[PDB]
Amino acid sequence: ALTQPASVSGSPGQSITISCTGTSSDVGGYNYVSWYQQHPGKAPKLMIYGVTNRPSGVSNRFSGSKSGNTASLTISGLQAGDEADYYCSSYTSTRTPYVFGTGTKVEIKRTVAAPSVFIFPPSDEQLKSGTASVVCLLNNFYPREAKVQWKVDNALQSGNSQESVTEQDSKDSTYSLSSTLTLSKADYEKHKVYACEVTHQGLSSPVTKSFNRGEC
Amino acid sequence: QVQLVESGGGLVQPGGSLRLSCAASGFTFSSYAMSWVRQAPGKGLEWVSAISGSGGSTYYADSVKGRFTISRDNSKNTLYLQMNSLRAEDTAVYYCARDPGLWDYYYGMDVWGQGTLVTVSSASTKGPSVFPLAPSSKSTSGGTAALGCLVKDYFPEPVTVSWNSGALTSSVHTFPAVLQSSGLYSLSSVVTVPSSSLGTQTYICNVNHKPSNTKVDKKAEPK
Ligand SMILES: C[C@]12CC[C@H]3[C@@H](CCC4=CC(=O)CC[C@@]43C)[C@@H]1CC[C@@H]2O
């Protein structure tokens, strides 16, 4: 596709710019570059067509341009809600009639916010199935970087967990993370203490949350 | 009432076939090139095919040319991606979209439908089991409590989770599904709420995995 940076970040009120690098047969030689904004889980929205044109209704905070073989989207006065993926596209004089760029994720910078952390035991319901899931929630932290590891009876766990992170929140610009520990009921029942230890910028040292299996 | 409503997505076996539909309303469908764009899970938009307003010129991407065919109906206002010979790598959300260029093209798609998931896999539908993540006294956050539901072992995507039938939305995090080495997806949906509310408000997640006719409401509660 058309070359875009993987990611662009700035603070609210900044102006940031996303480039889109093509060739003389597309972005460089013709004035049919478009830009789309796509929020997590929604359809893209047309922000700019014909290099510089904004469809009626699109905020004048978004402007398009190009120089040589590179088009740029400039978003002025960055908002929290401006977090999204952005795609350019171009007509090409080649067999290719139309192509998209590789897309850029816009991250809004904000103050450091330590995760609030929670641990959940497997449900009584679930154990009857011969498997236990223990979940650790890291809520509303910033920056994105986190580490979470599992300790059962104090022994660091390897290879029995998966993590999922949310997209940057549109209002508070934070992230949340789940860490899920999967054990056989059998293995689960033959240990007592279950702990999630979180490491994050906004926290002096690790925060641990645990419970004891069979504790109230 | 300007809109494009898609249908026909689903879980389809490899080498298999599928026909997608895209029903147009609120505009003169014949007057506009319409287009199919797809996005594989986590990936970018890939232009797949396009067709002239009249159908007389339909146009297609490389990666798809062999086995896909775009087509259209201006009385039924409907675009089709009869999609045949499907492979796993055509697994994506498929969108249709309008170029609003009336006498000329924008090279820009303005009106978009909502998307349809196409999953090309030889695995079969499997509904989730739903377990509470109960508010728990081993992390009692002064003023804020967390609880949730674990939605484990389903296929294909997607699953939807809401809380108290849509009443509770602020403070909800429904995490992106992750594929287990079991080949099944799993996710949790959580919510933070005042500790004080655990004694005054009941919390029930409503999970719906339409592909498997699995509907489930689970209460997430203390002790
Ligand atoms: C629809 C479209 C403008 C019209 C394009 C289409 C790509 C292929 C194409 C080839 C042609 O020769 C005529 C115009 C069309 C049909 C483009 C894809 C997106 C863009 O908006």
B131 and B73 in a common domain? no
Residue B99 makes CB contacts below 8 A (sequence gap 6+) with: B32, B33, B34, B35, B105, B106, B107, B108, B109, B110
B100 and B185 in a common domain? no
Strands (E), B13-57: 18-25, 34-39, 45-51
Contact criterion met (CB < 8 Å) for A43 and B138: no
CA of A84 to the centre of ligand 1 (A): 25
B110 and B134 in a common domain? no
Q: Which of B37, B51, B103, B107 to mutate to test the pocket of ligand 1 (most atoms within 8 A of CB)?
A: B107
| Integer CA distances (angstroms), A148 to A157, A161, A198, B49, B171, in order | 11, 10, 5, 43, 22
CB-closest option in B138, B186, B190 to A119: B138
User: Amino acid letter at A27?
Assistant: V
| Integer CA distances (angstroms), A68 to A29, A50, A58, A90, in order | 8, 15, 26, 14
CB-closest option in A49, A103, A126 to B107: A49
B104 and B17 in a common domain? yes
The answer to whether B154 and B185 are in contact (CB under 8 A) is yes
CA of A97 to the centre of ligand 1 (A): 6
The distance of B74 to chain A (nearest Cα, Å) reads 23
B203 and B147 in a common domain? yes
CA distance B137 to A111: 29
Other C-beta atoms closer than 10 Å to the C-beta of B56 total 7
CA distance B198 to B194: 7
The answer to whether A62 and A70 are in contact (CB under 8 A) is no
CA distance A142 to B52: 47
Q: How was this structure determined?
A: X-ray
CA distance B149 to B206: 9
Give B 41-70 residues with CB within 8 A of chain A.
44-47, 50, 59
CATH homologous superfamily for A1-110? Immunoglobulins (2.60.40.10)
A118, A160, A167, A213: which to substitute to probe chain B, counting the most B Cβ within 10 Å? A118
B134 and B96 in a common domain? no
Last residue of a domain, one of B95, B122, B149: B122
Last residue of a domain, one of B104, B122, B140: B122
Tokens 């232009």 found at = B47
B203 and B135 in a common domain? yes
B54 and B12 in a common domain? yes
Other C-beta atoms closer than 10 Å to the C-beta of B105 total 17
Q: Which of B37, B49, B99 to mutate to test the pocket of ligand 1 (most atoms within 8 A of CB)?
A: B99
Nearest to A74 by CA among A19, A13, A37: A19
In terms of CATH architecture, what is A111-216?
Answer: Sandwich (2.60)
Sheet holding A193-199, edge to edge: A155-156, A147-152, A193-199, A207-212
Give A 50-89 residues with CB within 8 A of chain B.
50, 55, 85, 87, 89
Strands (E), A22-174: 33-38, 45-48, 62-67, 70-75, 85-91, 98-100, 104-108, 116-120, 131-141, 147-152, 155-156, 161-165
B155 and B83 in a common domain? no
CA-atom Rg of chain B in angstroms: 21
Q: Is A128 exposed, middle or buried (0-12, 13-18, 19+ CB in 10 A)?
A: exposed
Q: Could you say which DSSP state residue A113 is in?
A: B
CA distance A177 to A138: 5
Give A 125-154 residues with CB within 8 A of chain B.
125-126, 129, 133, 135, 137, 139
Last residue of a domain, one of B87, B122, B157: B122
Sign of CA dihedral B43, B46, B48, B51: positive
> Kind and range of the H or E element at A185?
helix A185-189
* CATH number of the domain encompassing residue B206: 2.60.40.10
Contact criterion met (CB < 8 Å) for B131 and A125: yes
Domain parsing of chain A, residue ranges: 1-110, 111-216
Q: Are domains A1-110 and A111-216 of this chain identical in fold?
A: yes
Closest residue in A to B147 (Cα) is A120
Domain boundaries, position B56: 2-122
B137 and B117 in a common domain? no
CA of B107 to the centre of ligand 1 (A): 7
CA distance B175 to B55: 41
B75 and B11 in a common domain? yes
User: Amino acid letter at A185?
Assistant: K
